[PDB]
Amino acid sequence: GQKINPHGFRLGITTEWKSRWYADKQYKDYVKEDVAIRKLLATGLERAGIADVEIERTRDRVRVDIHTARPGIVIGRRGTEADRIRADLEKLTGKQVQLNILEVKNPESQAQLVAQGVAEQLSNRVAFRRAMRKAIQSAMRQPNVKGIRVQCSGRLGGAEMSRSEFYREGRVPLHTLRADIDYGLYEAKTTFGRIGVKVWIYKGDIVG
Template sequence: MAHKVHPKAFRIQGIADWNIRGFYRKNTAQYFEEDFRIKEFLSKKLKDASVEDIKIERVDNKINVIIETARPGLIIGRGGEGVGKLKAMLEKELLQEKSRTAFFETKGKKISLPAVEIKIEIREVRNPWISASLVAQFAAQQIEKRTPFRQVLKRTLNKVMGNKEVKGARIEVAGRLNGVEIARTEWLKLGQLPRATIRANINYAQAQAYCTYGVIGIKVWIYKGEQFKEENQ
């Protein structure tokens, strides 16, 4: 049987890049845990802010958090006060997490990570319809509003294919579609989608729609043509 591979992980040495970048001399697992907590906290806080991705860059004891969103004004707030509040909440959450978690305790040794300086950078996503993450979030919102899933697939795919950068796209939904008793998988595809080509620039994301009859899983692939490493840099 074929094995499913994440499209981005498949291309990480070719045209894709890591979401978390940094070098850890020791306590690597603890730093990974801290990075995971940062992404988890921000994802929950900014659930309705059309966030495409959250990237983390570490240099010494400084953390640069890059938030890519289609609605930057909602996060920045008036006079930038939104970013300041978000930074304060994140610092407080990390401090509380370090004090209460047992993950940082090993046999006969309690590990404490040094204090870090956090900087939050907001980047605008100008066209949300070529972002697989934002398209998946849109489809999930429509399904949660009880829109028939076939209508959601067709409408969303037509909007995606209306962009000249897009060469092909596929949207897949799985679960108790329209509330039926037996779960199944349905998908719709337009254009090209060479998933086995490493230099193919494929944007992939998944989301969940929480309905009264269960959870509907949504996967989105958007193909933007072939790309070489030099072009990405």
């Protein structure tokens, strides 16, 4: 357990909470609902490519912002998917929700989405070295990215002995608190088990 989660390490300084509310008495109930919402969302738009979910609460208003690579599949042109999700949302939550389905500017700068892309290639029996190098090159071309690291571990290539390989390009200063490190993790599903993909994308320094 050698590496502190990059997001949590910077949570007070360089990154921000993925949910905004205040409650004293309702805190436990709010968390329970959040758990339910995020499990309902993480297992719905899997092939849509979700990076972030932000949940805002106040009175009964439940604002859910879903960041996605392409919103096309997250909203049918008839609103079909928005209506289906809002239906299950309000049902579960008990109150009224406003899905603000957004979209990500630079998909290939987004560590969670880069992790999903590597994972899906491994799910489609792509040589893991290929997927690693592809993600590295795509990310480094984009203007903010000053460095990237990608790590895949598990039964790589279907072998019986676990391997943990990593490729790195540029700077990835994990120990620097002011360094803006974007972290993503995704679990690729394969005939021989699960292989974990971690991505660290350094995008520069924040002073506040």
